[PDB]
Design a protein around this ligand. Sequence first.
Ligand SMILES: CCO[C@@H](Cc1ccc(OCCc2ccc(OS(C)(=O)=O)cc2)cc1)C(=O)O
Length: 258
Amino acid sequence: ESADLRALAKHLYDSYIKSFPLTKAKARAILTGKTTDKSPFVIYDMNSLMMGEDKIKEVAIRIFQGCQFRSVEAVQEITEYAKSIPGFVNLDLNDQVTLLKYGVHEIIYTMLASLMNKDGVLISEGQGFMTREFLKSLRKPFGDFMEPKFEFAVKFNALELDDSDLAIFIAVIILSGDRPGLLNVKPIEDIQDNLLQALELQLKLNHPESSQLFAKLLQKMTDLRQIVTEHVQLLQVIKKTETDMSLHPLLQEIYKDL
Ligand SMILES: CCO[C@@H](Cc1ccc(OCCc2ccc(OS(C)(=O)=O)cc2)cc1)C(=O)O
């Protein structure tokens, strides 16, 4: 029944709105700065950055740190959201932990696109905008870890998905089952199967003209994996070049064996 599938889509959208403070809707509205309710401060260089901490509540390491803090925060919102997916909290605890361990970063890069445009990314809850060119000019290793995200953001944003779409797609990512170390696959697959039906319908109804958008969206998932991997090894390099520093424990525990 299409009706049960719509009920599920609305449930997921609602929970998404409540779990994530900054939606794509608000983000795109800020990025298209014609809506002057509140425009962002733009950081494009050193002085921009220092003037940044001014109104916005070495450089490279500070940014690196910032991403980690935002990351840790996002893991907590995604975790809150995951709990709202029917059946998720009823799975064996070990698997709930596993699906989160592998889902979190694919979702973080997915939602990150929502705050990006070809030239930059919204930081500090939309109050700031950091350009792509500034991030790419960062010192030796810290100067290229963001580019892959932007390239993905550009292609991914072309699908023109909105928050209601994303909310179900996000749920499909978490209830994979192909994740390494799962004890009970079937209960996870039955759920994802149902989530897939809801996402298919949702795209069909919300994007009548977008031919095979469902297929195109699913393909984007192979892109996320490569982004995660690529980022993990760039992280390994940093941990070695900077011994006086360390990756936040949560991120560290998420990366232990992947
Ligand atoms: C290096 C840490 O990377 C995170 C993933 C990540 C990457 C980028 C990201 O957001 C990019 C936009 C951004 C840029 C600077 C920033 O810091 S600041 C101090 O300027 O607010 C915060 C977010 C969020 C999570 C991980 O491995 O878990």
